[PDB]
Every structure is written in structure tokens, then in C-alpha cells.
Design a binder for this molecule. Structure first.
Ligand SMILES: Nc1ncnc2c1ncn2[C@@H]1O[C@H](COP(=O)(O)OP(=O)(O)OP(=O)(O)OP(=O)(O)OC[C@H]2O[C@@H](n3cnc4c(N)ncnc43)[C@H](O)[C@@H]2O)[C@@H](O)[C@H]1O
Ligand SMILES: Nc1ncnc2c1ncn2[C@@H]1O[C@H](COP(=O)(O)OP(=O)(O)OP(=O)(O)O)[C@@H](O)[C@H]1O
Length: 134
């Protein structure tokens, strides 16, 4: 069993949340592997920009999710740390690794999300952002 560790962001702009559509056609949150020499917060900010071209600023830590996945028979146990972010600059645009990047009203975002962890993280992010007048 292999272990992986990523960090991502749940970024809001004027009430809407930033999402990306994966190659599998699933809408999820922008994230990436925590590279050697990076703290998870650094990874999250960098990955949001590389994947969506949007610059965000971390307001606080939201939570962590876990999931198992297989690839060509290998099994990997993956952990993703998510951070709440406020929109700073830029216009959503997909990286070469994603199909699309776009802002969605909270309501539509709820219907688009699929992964158990994403739904759980989103709910936590929503409660948490009210505190930051976001
Ligand atoms: N992704 C992968 N690719 C290829 N081969 C793999 C692999 N994962 C495992 N393997 C292979 O599978 C084997 C089994 O390894 P595991 O099963 O990974 O390890 P352990 O033996 O459980 O002790 P360990 O090192 O896990 O614990 P620690 O809490 O320190 O470590 C906690 C984990 O957290 C990560 N981590 C800890 N601190 C971190 C930090 N500060 N920032 C980012 N990541 C951090 C570490 O990378 C560490 O694995 C390894 O022998 C390896 O050969
Ligand atoms: N939150 C989640 N819960 C469950 N499964 C997930 C989740 N996210 C992704 N997956 C599934 O796990 C597998 C790997 O996706 P993941 O996104 O982790 O891959 P990746 O592209 O290598 O990673 P990173 O984006 O960290 O660069 C896929 O089969 C995917 O459908």
C-alpha cells in the first residue's frame, strides 16, 4: 500500500465557490501533491493557481479527508488537507490536467460535487466562511 498527501483550496468569490472538472468528468476542488519543501498551505495556494489560474488567500484550515484508490492494480491511501480561501485576482481557466475551472453558486455546487469527502469539506467550509464575512 502506497500513501499520498495532497493539499487543496475551497475558494470563494462574491458568494460563489471555485470548482474544477476532472478528466473523469467529476467536479471537485483544485488540489495537488505536497511537494518536498512545501508546507500544505503553500501547496494549496500554488495548486489553486496552477489548476485554475486564480490567486487566493488562505483564511483558515477547513479539514482533512481520506480515500483509497487503485491505479493499474496498485492501491493508494490518499489524504487531502483543505483550506478556506478568499478570491484575490485572476479569471478561472483550466490547467492542462483539468477539463475546466469555474465559479458556481453554492446551490449548484452542492449538486455538482460527487465525492463523499468533497461534500463533507464543502459543508464545513460553508459554516466556517460565515465567520470571515465571506
Ligand atoms: N507513495 C508511495 N510511493 C511509493 N512507494 C510507497 C509510497 N508509499 C509507500 N510506499 C512504499 O511502501 C512502504 C510502506 O510505507 P508506509 O507504509 O508508508 O510506512 P510505515 O512503514 O507506515 O511508517 P511511516 O513512515 O509510514 O510513517 P510516517 O508517519 O513517518 O509517515 C507518515 C507519512 O506522511 C508523510 N508526511 C509526513 N510528514 C509530512 C510532512 N511534514 N509533509 C508532508 N508529508 C508528510 C510521509 O511522506 C509518510 O509517509 C514503504 O516501505 C515504501 O517502500
Ligand atoms: N475526494 C475523493 N474521494 C474519493 N475518491 C477520489 C477523491 N478524489 C479523487 N478520487 C479518486 O481517486 C483517484 C485519484 O484521483 P486524484 O485526484 O487523487 O488523483 P491525481 O490526479 O493523481 O491527484 P492530485 O490531484 O493530488 O494531483 C481517482 O480514481 C479519483 O476518482
Amino acid at each position: 500500500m502506497k500513501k499520498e498527501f495532497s493539499a487543496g483550496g475551497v475558494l470563494f468569490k462574491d458568494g460563489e465557490v471555485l470548482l474544477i472538472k476532472t478528466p473523469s468528468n467529476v467536479w471537485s476542488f483544485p488540489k495537488g501533491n505536497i511537494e518536498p519543501g512545501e508546507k500544505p498551505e503553500e501547496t494549496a495556494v500554488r495548486e489553486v493557481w496552477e489548476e485554475t489560474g486564480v490567486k487566493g488567500e488562505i483564511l483558515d484550515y477547513i479539514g482533512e479527508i481520506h480515500y483509497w484508490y487503485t491505479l493499474k492494480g496498485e492501491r493508494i491511501f490518499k489524504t487531502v488537507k483543505y483550506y478556506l480561501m478568499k478570491y484575490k485576482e485572476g479569471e478561472p481557466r483550466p490547467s492542462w490536467e483539468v477539463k475546466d475551472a469555474k465559479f458556481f453558486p453554492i446551490k449548484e455546487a452542492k449538486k455538482l460535487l460527487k465525492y463523499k469527502g468533497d461534500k463533507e469539506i464543502f459543508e464545513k467550509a460553508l459554516k466556517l466562511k460565515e465567520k470571515f464575512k465571506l
